[model samples]
Target: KVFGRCELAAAMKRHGLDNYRGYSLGNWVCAAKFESNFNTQATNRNTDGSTDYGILQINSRWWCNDGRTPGSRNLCNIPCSALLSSDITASVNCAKKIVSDGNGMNAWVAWRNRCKGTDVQAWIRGCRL
Candidate 1:
């Protein structure tokens, strides 16, 4: 809820996402759009009984604990609720961990489905960052 697409790109750049962990800002911005439309409070329950939390839609089965999902790796070691904040610092940090854990943006379904091999310049079109 804190930024439009361009603003988000700029903000993410300020947060050190310009070339973060070998990912482009366009990839990050596009993933956020499909995942949560940049809304920090976003949450969705998956058909597998896991929940996705925050802008990156981090899963309860792996990244965070929501108290209902069982046997989560909780790799980020943060509460799911902590991800749902306008500040987005924790979300960004957790996303870095997720990326480092495996193949770049492949951890995010939204990135795989919506952003992969697509033109991503629109995500940073107007902000001029």
Candidate 2:
């Protein structure tokens, strides 16, 4: 486990993620909730033979290595297993890189389906940061 919504907001702010690559902090927090329920240890293998890892559910197809799987791009140059840790620095850094690569939060499907074009105020409501 990593954080509740409130702690996540605080951590995002502390990490200078309030407005990363033109996306709001709420965007990331909301996506994180839907992706892994704030659990850093989360991992999900997709039907496409790709795997998602960490709080952001980063895909093995491009961001991290899935040694058991073939043709992993590993754009983030980190192990997928590293993402499944309580320390979120690696995940956060990699997510930022993804965002900077012109994907923005669009790299995360949860952001598009759940957060896009929606009022995400509740994601950070009453959160102290």
Candidate 3:
């Protein structure tokens, strides 16, 4: 699943995070953006075009080999599918795992230093859309 900036902001707030400045949240967003332009509906295909699908661009073979055959429309898991469908809060919390498990958004610290030029909101106003 892909997350828009608003969705990202709301997700950060849910985790009691005022922003996505520090932890790996930005990195995850960076990766996701680079991966699929935050397109929750993104998809690609192999040579056959019959072996690939879904928003996160996961491989069909991975899902199929996991013994969780979803028949047609794939079932998303925590890191891939559910993470994709996750709202802002869940997304932030999910990304926070990349950092140490403390009590706040420290997960973003490393990412902040790495991903330059991205703006971060230290305190959220709201995402009532």
Looking at model 2, which ten-residue stretch has the lowest summed lDDT? Answer: 8-17
Top lDDT: which candidate number?
A: 1
lDDT for 105 in candidate 1 is 89
Residue-level error in angstroms, candidate 3, position 118: 10
**How would you encode candidate 1's per-residue C-alpha lDDT over 1-129 as one tens digit per residue?**
646888778777887877788888999999999999988899999988889998889999999988888766788999999999888888888988998886888999889999999988778877776
Candidate 2 lDDT over 1-129, as tens digits, reads: 778899888887777778888788888899999999999999999987999999999999889997866777999999999998777888888898988987678778888899988887789988875
The better candidate by lDDT, 2 or 3, is: 2
lDDT of 3: 0.42
What are the RMSD figures for all models against the true structure?
1.2, 1.2, 8.2
Full candidate order by TM-score, most accurate first:
1, 2, 3
> Candidate 3: RMSD over Cα atoms?
8.2
CA lDDT, every model vs. true structure: 0.87, 0.87, 0.42
State the lDDT at 73 in candidate 2: 91
Evaluate residue 61 in candidate 1 and report its C-alpha lDDT on the 0 to 100 scale: 94
Model 2 has how many clashing residue pairs?
0
